[PDB]
Design a protein around this ligand. Structure first.
Ligand code: NI
Length: 262
């Protein structure tokens, strides 16, 4: 038993974005500018409280190119993820899409994001229950399971934060005994920004990696469903917000470098 409430709200100022971290209208406005510029096609998977839960993809998936998914914003206190993706998108040109079918799920929990807390506004954890209790958002994602499995065949990265942490770590899944270059490259990217953590649910973190720990999360679901490689980065929430934005963007850049190399 712990005294730290999952219902607690957390908010930061961003100098990169010149707004507060829970400024969901600004988020959607900036995101839309980037997806327009990059020629990405919006697929709305659902909506709650007037906020769309969108998947963005290339106008066409090419069979010869790897298919990668990056997701974030399952937990509303973990705001560096969705803003990290926006920072990442700002850095990209359309040429990236000639070598990879990149899919983006920037913000799964907009009601939690708006209020700066982990749950949606109905008290549910959107990153639990995937096997197929799920949250409303989880159910809407599961209505598009086949589309999401297609999108993540060659790899999935989820960008989380551990709000009370000062150190960083990564969860990883590979079809091997021991972590390889995929896992260690991600760890190293995160490690440029923060000190590595040296337990999650009785499971030890070893050299900043938690390896092949299956639970009912979206990422474990996609691995059981066939994704070749998966990771969940965890930036420390007790550190500087704009540095967390930078670190998330850097994890994403490394994921793409490993999985869709030049
Ligand atoms: Ni999280």
């Amino acid at each position: 038993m712990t005294s730290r409430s999952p219902f607690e709200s957390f908010v930061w100022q961003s100098e990169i974005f010149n707004c507060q971290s829970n400024d969901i209208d600004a988020f959607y406005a900036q995101l839309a500018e980037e997806v327009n510029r990059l020629g990405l096609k919006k697929n709305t998977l659902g909506s709650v409280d007037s906020f769309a839960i969108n998947l963005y993809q290339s106008a066409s998936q090419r069979s010869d190119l790897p298919s990668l998914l990056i997701s974030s914003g399952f937990h509303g206190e973990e705001a560096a993820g969705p803003w990290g993706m926006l920072h990442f998108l700002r850095g990209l040109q359309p040429a990236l899409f000639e070598r990879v079918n990149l899919s983006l799920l920037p913000l799964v929990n907009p009601t939690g994001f708006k209020a700066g807390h982990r749950f949606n506004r109905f008290g549910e954890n959107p990153n639990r229950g995937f096997t197929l209790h799920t949250s409303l958002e989880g159910k809407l994602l599961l209505e598009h399971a086949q589309l999401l499995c297609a999108a993540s065949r060659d790899g999935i990265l989820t960008c989380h934060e551990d709000v009370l942490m000062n150190e960083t770590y990564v969860y990883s899944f590979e079809p091997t005994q021991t972590p390889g270059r995929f896992s260690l490259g991600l760890r190293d990217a995160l490690g440029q920004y923060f000190k590595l953590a040296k337990f999650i649910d009785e499971c030890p973190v070893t050299d900043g990696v938690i390896f092949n720990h299956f639970d009912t999360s979206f990422e474990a679901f996609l691995v059981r469903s066939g994704a070749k490689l998966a990771a969940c980065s965890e930036t420390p929430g007790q550190e500087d917000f704009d540095r967390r934005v930078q670190a998330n963007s850097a994890a994403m850049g490394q994921f793409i470098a490993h999985c869709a190399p030049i």
